[PDB]
A and B are shown apart, each in its own frame.
With several copies, the nearest count.
Chain A
Amino acid sequence: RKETYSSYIYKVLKQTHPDTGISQKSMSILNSFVNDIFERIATEASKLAAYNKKSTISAREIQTAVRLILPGELAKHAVSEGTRAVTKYSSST
């Protein structure tokens, strides 16, 4: 069960460019890019958790790490979309 992100980026490509296909080398580009971003953001969040005598990683540390990693317009759009997703998930009532 070798695990990869192929199906998910296949659909989010399919909701905006329906008549377009992906090559396998390109498929690997997006897979490696997603894994690299995940690794960078997660190790920065762990470093910031170890900053403050804190043994728990929560959403605030990842928000600070996103504001640290990304450039500014990407950062403000990422925290806007992530905050909307968190408020969608939390108000599941």
Chain B
Amino acid sequence: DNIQGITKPAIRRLARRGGVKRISGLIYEETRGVLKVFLENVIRDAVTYTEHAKRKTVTAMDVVYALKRQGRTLYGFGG
């Protein structure tokens, strides 16, 4: 129930926002896996960024500059 916070209607909605029509009944686990690796990359970079700043909470500024390092830059939450 740890990874099970995200669920079948959530990734059904996400696949529907991908414009797909028919999904498979066990595409569940590899989507959960790529979910996990994307978050652990992003918050590993955010944790290093906030570690060097002596800031032991993770701020929004750190994660948007983590994405801008990663080449997936976000607009609206600072920059």
Contacts and interface: CB of A to CB of B under 8 A. Distances in A.
Direct contact, A vs B (beta carbon within 8 Å): yes
B76 interface: yes
B65 A32 contact: no
Contacts of B45: 68
Contacts of A61: 52
A67 B69 CA distance: 14
B52 A25 contact: no
A28 B65 contact: no
Contacts, number: 36
B5 interface: no
Interface in B46-74: 48-49, 51-53, 65, 69, 73
A28 B53 contact: no
Contacts of B49: 51
B25 interface: no
B52 A29 contact: no
A60 interface: yes
B78 interface: yes
Interface of A: 4, 25, 28-29, 31-33, 35-36, 48, 51-52, 60-61, 64, 67-68
Interface of B: 45, 48-49, 51-53, 65, 69, 73, 75-79
Q: Which 7 A-B pairs have the closest CB atoms?
A: A32-B75, A32-B79, A28-B79, A29-B75, A28-B76, A64-B52, A29-B76
